[PDB]
Design a protein around this ligand. Structure first.
Ligand SMILES: *C(=O)[C@@H](NC(=O)/C(=N\OC(C)(C)C(=O)O)c1csc(N)n1)[C@H](C)NS(=O)(=O)O
Length: 261
């Protein structure tokens, strides 16, 4: 059956709602499934916050090494890196690395605070031509992922387009683009998500997110060995608040849409 039929069948088996957008940069073709529907981004939103700081750094050569004080009161629900630095400092670069590669929620919050609040992350997305993205809350409440809640949402297509712009395209000056890509490639949290649906030796940069309603997300740039890059967003969410997360669904979707590549 067709790729579309395969995705529909995956969603049917899934017990939830699947959103996929793949951009094949070889020919600019797309594989879209519920790609204009809103999903809670959860921690995939951290890419936008880190990139907003990278944009600022273009015009401030001291920004990435700027010290940020980490206090006990900054710790939240999940902060494996920031907890190592309580009573000390981390640089903005180190906070970007922790936010993206470990999904440290304290690090995300420091990025947001530095920028001046969630609305400034939204403004940065808008500056990239993304009319869809919105950040409304800090971590961890940005991961509540309540069905139909527009807060902290985007669509798979909007996020795939913006991720392509960020990592391979026109959003950031070169040094900054390269830094974002280095961060994403070194992600530690994505083994069982998109990466698990791909050949083991393909190079991937990604950012995961998991929240309530079993909301299980991953956004990736994928470099095949003999082909142009693919940009892939896989979002998944479920009807019940305490549903288990389902990274296996994301891996399955990735395998479906990258077949033949
Ligand atoms: C981002 O998506 C972020 N999610 C959370 O902080 C929530 N749970 O995360 C962990 C991994 C601890 C979990 O047990 O699911 C969460 C659930 S409900 C709520 N308000 N927050 C995590 C840290 N990012 S990820 O990339 O590791 O998924």
């Amino acid at each position: 059956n067709s790729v579309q039929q395969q995705l529909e069948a995956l969603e049917k088996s899934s017990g939830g709602r699947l959103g996929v957008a793949l951009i094949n940069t070889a020919d600019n073709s797309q594989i879209l499934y519920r790609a204009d529907e809103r999903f809670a981004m959860c921690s995939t939103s951290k890419v936008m916050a880190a990139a907003a700081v990278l944009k600022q750094s273009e015009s401030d050569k001291h920004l990435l090494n700027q010290r940020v004080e980490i206090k006990k009161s900054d710790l939240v629900n999940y902060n494996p890196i920031a907890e190592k630095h309580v009573n000390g400092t981390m640089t903005l670069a180190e906070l970007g690395a922790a936010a993206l590669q470990y999904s440290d929620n304290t690090a995300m919050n420091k990025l947001i605070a530095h920028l001046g609040g969630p609305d400034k992350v939204t403004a940065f997305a808008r500056s990239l031509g993304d009319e869809t993205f919105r950040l409304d809350r800090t971590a961890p409440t940005l991961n509540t992922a309540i069905p139909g809640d527009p807060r902290d949402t985007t669509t798979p297509l909007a996020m795939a387009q913006t991720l392509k712009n960020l990592t391979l395209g026109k959003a950031l000056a070169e040094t900054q683009r390269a830094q974002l890509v280095t961060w994403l490639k070194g992600n530690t949290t994505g083994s069982a998500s998109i990466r698990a649906g791909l050949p083991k030796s393909w190079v991937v940069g990604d950012k995961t997110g998991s929240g309530d309603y079993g909301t299980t997300n991953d956004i990736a740039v994928i470099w095949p060995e003999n082909h142009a890059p693919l940009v892939l967003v896989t979002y998944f969410t479920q009807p019940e608040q305490k549903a288990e997360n389902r990274n296996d669904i994301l891996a399955a979707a990735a395998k479906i849409v990258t077949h033949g590549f």
